[PDB]
Design a protein around this nucleic acid. Structure first.
Lengths: 224, 386, 136, 62
RNA sequence: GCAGUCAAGCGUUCAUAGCGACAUUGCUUUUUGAUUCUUCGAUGUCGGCUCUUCCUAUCAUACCGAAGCAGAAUUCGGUAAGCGUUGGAUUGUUCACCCACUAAUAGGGAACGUGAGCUGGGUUUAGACCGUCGUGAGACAGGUUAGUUUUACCCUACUGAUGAAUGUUACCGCAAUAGUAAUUGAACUUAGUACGAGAGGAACAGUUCAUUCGGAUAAUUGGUUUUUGCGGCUGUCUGAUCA
């Protein structure tokens, strides 16, 4: 069920939230109607942790990781890291990441198997990412956009990509990621689709401006 | 003609006239409203302003952007000698306001309030209160007559206190006498409290406490005569103006054929009686309390005194109120701290706070160090002793 | 500040009045901007409406693609270089000024944003935060 | 609470003490006071400023 | 310029939700006229900058009444000026029309406020140019340029500062009186709820911030610097050094 949700007026759930297989990270500044869609269908499956990252509320675009790892940037304080260490279980691997090139969520568009990052990150941070996540890190840009985190939502089942993308790069990423891709939009045709929704194996929360022809394609390609 | 573009005024017509204060001690115009149920205590307190310093605290404001997050803000440390009572005085409610009917002084006054009455102490015969100290020779029939008259009459009861100026790093030796009203019930109980506490220490661990909103009354810093731009805020005129470009340009219309009282003129800026309400107390620190400046997160033994003392003041080895924000009045002034008039239910008040870090770096420069042991650690050994 | 923005921003310092030319920091094709007024600004006799970090400004373009020229358009400031005070203690300032063109709801007209982006902008404007690179 | 180390001299920075500077390549610098900041905006090399830490660490001073 | 009274008709129907013809009673003195009573032994004559105060025939804000008020947006009105009414382009502008924000871009007065307060773009002395008219000197209902704006040390008013005398002198107070100050928005929430066929779509209380103002401060940040406080550097002069 691609449940449509506002974050208090806005329909990009990937900005204020990070949905993974074991953990769900959310912003603190919200009402109960933002969390009812999560707590009704999840209920007692994954721990939802209310937190902030680096003195912000954009923790979906600040941290980036998978089921096995959660990578945190520089400006995250001691108390946030301690609360996430005590809140998230011992299976996830948390590591402070030193890079001055972006935030980690905009760089990394990954899943449990194959990572796609910003092409301009160096080797010492890439070794740390492939060490903590345990993921073969690859380097690609979709449709010329160096930020793959803003125009690509990735899961293990499938993935949504940038809407203005040629078929050749789609087939190259279907050979590389080994998943089928369908170019689509979200929220009445908003081109930013990497932040417009989150997805994992069980849940894919979308925004309220998503109509039925976009939602049918989303629930077809992610196979809920 | 109308003003052709209409603007908010310069300055505030309620803080008029701007003549200088009576003295450096600012009169407390009004005291908290009394209800005859509370235990008997004071309403205000007198201290001396020691400067400012920096406080890191965890902001705990639910629904905010910095919730449970570190902020830094300024506090003022106002010094606190234990203020000692030397007399009481009761006022009867008349059809022309409260009138002081009698006053009673204590038995053996200290030499500071004996220094307060003399403009010329060194020449004097030092004969303060001699024929009043002789009234304790009998059982005290005159003095107990005065107290019975205060009990019988006098709906309000105020107490003459003074600061202990010798316990201060000031250099004045003269104490500022004052009056303080009381909050307890049943004015016989107030005046029996005063008769018990003649010549007794009254420290701030009983009058104020942590987290409470207090008003502060003092006299403004003095900047002397002043021109009308920096005093009121009036626009500077252009570069090209013959005869003065830091002025009010137009004084007024033809008719009224007089200068109005509301136009901005040049005069005294500073040294006025000011009052600032809702100031929060972050510390009530004590003199015998070693390591005033440690905190439950900090735990390192240091006082709130900066390295090399507060600038122009000295070193706090006394009690102190440590109050959030600014305060009217500069350093070394007699500052009066007053309990709040209204109960403040505002959620900016009633926020029970505890500090995390007190700054004690030197206010006399760019202080790179908080404690001198830290400086001996970081900078290392030098050309001195070893 | 103004309508359409998400969240409330604590007051940060105003160091860009009417007329400031900022180095436009996205790939939208504009090379520079030009502030003409500030959304949410107030009025005082002989006071210029000043911009700050994160605030929405009406601005024009003085360079770039001639499609983008000669037309008033919304914009969002992402760097300031006049030092403002965060509540956690610091006074901080970037190397230069900056700005990105937006629609009246907050979407990037461009796609990518270059260099740093101050976090007091990225938290107020969500769409900027997703296209943002370095936050803080 | 973190005790930040300086970027120019090497001193320690208490909360609310000095400025923060973000050069356009997003390498963030912290300065103790106005002094070491205004020297850094002259592009002086801190390895040859005799009172800083990277000077004294290099010549083995104490 | 503003406001009535009557009321033919519009408004689906329906004189008066809102309007209102034909008539008719007034108010105002921010227009312009008419007069010429004051001033020609001279009240410095446009505009803007600045700054205070006042009125209300209210633009916003507060509280309400009416509707062709379902909600939203509006429209008409009542108490009320308490507080607020802007940044810009062209022009000497008054007026003006435009761009843009705004809760709103209300209207006016005070010797058409305010030149011993400013500026002096315009007008309006003397220089000079062009067109037109003149036989000419010259005229211009027209254009363009260049063109000195003096004094306060008096009384008063206002703002600040002392002050003899009511026994002296000091400390602690009361209060007549006079002034007063705060203002406004956004987001979240209520809530895609109420209301609605759908499109659309609020409010009351709460939370966090912000706009204009006002008073204070100076920990930190920035500015100033004759701490000529420390260091550096040019030229010269102290025989070189050191200073």
């Amino acid at each position: 069920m691609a449940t449509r949700t506002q974050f208090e007026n806005s329909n990009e759930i990937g900005v204020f939230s990070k949905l993974t297989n074991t953990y769900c990270l959310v912003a603190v500044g919200g009402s109960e109607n933002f969390y009812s869609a999560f707590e009704a269908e999840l209920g007692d499956a994954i721990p939802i942790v209310h937190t902030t990252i680096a003195g912000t509320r954009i923790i979906g675009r600040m941290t980036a990781g998978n089921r096995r790892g959660l990578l945190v940037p520089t400006q995250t304080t001691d108390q946030e890291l301690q609360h996430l260490r005590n809140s998230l279980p011992d299976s996830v691997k948390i590591q402070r990441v030193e890079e001055r090139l972006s935030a980690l969520g905009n760089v990394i568009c990954c899943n449990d198997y194959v990572a796609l990052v910003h092409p301009d990150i160096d080797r010492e941070t890439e070794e740390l990412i492939s060490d903590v996540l345990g993921v073969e890190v690859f380097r690609q840009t979709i449709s010329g956009n160096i930020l793959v985190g803003s125009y690509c939502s990735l899961s293990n089942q499938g993935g949504l990509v940038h809407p203005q993308t040629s078929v050749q790069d789609q087939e190259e990423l279907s050979s590389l990621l080994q998943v089928p891709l369908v170019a689509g939009t979200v929220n009445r045709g908003s081109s930013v689709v990497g932040a417009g929704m989150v997805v994992n194996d069980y849940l894919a929360v979308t925004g309220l401006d998503t109509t039925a022809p976009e939602l049918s394609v989303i629930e077809s390609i992610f196979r809920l | 003609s109308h003003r052709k573009y209409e603007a908010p005024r310069h300055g505030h017509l309620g803080f008029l006239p701007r003549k200088r204060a009576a003295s450096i001690r600012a009169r407390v115009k009004a005291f908290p409203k009394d209800d005859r149920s509370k235990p008997v205590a004071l309403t205000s307190f007198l201290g001396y302003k020691a400067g400012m310093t920096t406080i890191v605290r965890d902001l705990d404001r639910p629904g905010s952007k910095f919730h449970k997050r570190e902020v830094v803000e300024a506090v003022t440390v106002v010094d606190t000698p234990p203020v000692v009572v030397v007399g009481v005085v009761g006022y009867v409610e008349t059809p022309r306001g409260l009138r002081s009917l009698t006053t009673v002084w204590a038995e053996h006054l200290s030499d500071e309030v004996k220094r307060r009455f003399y403009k010329n102490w060194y020449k004097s015969k030092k004969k303060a209160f001699t024929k009043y100290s002789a009234k304790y020779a009998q059982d005290g029939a005159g003095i107990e007559r005065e107290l019975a008259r205060i009990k019988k009459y006098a709906s309000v009861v105020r107490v003459l206190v003074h600061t202990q100026i010798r316990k201060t790093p000031l250099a004045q030796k003269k104490a500022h006498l004052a009056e303080i009203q009381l909050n307890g019930g049943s004015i016989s109980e107030k005046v029996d409290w005063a008769r018990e506490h003649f010549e007794k220490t009254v420290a701030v661990d009983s009058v104020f406490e942590q987290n409470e909103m207090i008003d502060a009354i003092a006299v403004t810093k003095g900047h002397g005569f002043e021109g009308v731009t920096h005093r009121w805020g009036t626009k500077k005129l252009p570069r090209k103006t013959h005869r003065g470009l830091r002025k009010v340009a137009c004084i007024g219309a033809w008719h009224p054929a007089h200068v109005m009282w509301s136009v901005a003129r040049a005069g005294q800026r500073g040294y006025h009686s000011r009052t600032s309400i809702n100031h929060k107390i972050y510390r009530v620190g004590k003199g015998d309390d070693e390591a005033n400046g440690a905190t439950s997160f900090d735990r390192t033994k240091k006082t709130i005194t900066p390295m090399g003392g507060f600038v122009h003041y000295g070193e706090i080895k006394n009690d102190f109120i440590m109050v959030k924000g600014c305060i009217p009045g500069n350093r070394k002034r007699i500052v009066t701290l007053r309990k709040s008039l209204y109960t403040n239910t505002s959620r900016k008040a009633l926020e029970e706070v505890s500090l995390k870090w007190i700054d004690t770096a030197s206010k006399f420069g760019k202080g790179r160090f908080q404690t001198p042991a830290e400086k001996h650690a970081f900078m290392g050994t030098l050309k001195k002793d070893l | 500040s103004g309508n359409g923005a998400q969240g409330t921003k604590f007051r940060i310092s105003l160091g860009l009045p009417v007329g400031a030319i900022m180095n436009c920091a996205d790939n939208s094709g504009a090379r520079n901007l030009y502030i003409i007024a500030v959304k949410g600004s107030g009025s005082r006799l002989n006071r210029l409406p000043a911009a700050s970090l994160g605030d929405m400004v009406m601005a024009t373009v003085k360079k770039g693609k001639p499609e983008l020229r000669k037309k008033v358009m919304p914009a969002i400031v992402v760097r300031q270089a006049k030092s403002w005070r965060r509540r956690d203690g610091v006074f901080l300032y970037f190397e230069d000024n900056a700005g990105v063109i937006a629609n009246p709801k907050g979407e990037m007209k461009g796609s990518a944003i270059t260099g740093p982006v101050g976090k007091e902008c990225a938290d107020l404007w969500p769409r900027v935060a997703s296209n943002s690179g370095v936050v803080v | 609470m973190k005790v930040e180390i300086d970027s120019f001299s090497g001193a320690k920075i208490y909360p609310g003490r000095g400025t923060l500077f973000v050069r356009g390549d997003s390498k963030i610098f912290r300065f103790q006071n106005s002094k070491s900041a205004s020297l850094f905006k002259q592009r002086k090399n801190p390895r040859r400023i005799a009172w800083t830490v990277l000077f004294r660490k290099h010549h083995k001073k104490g």
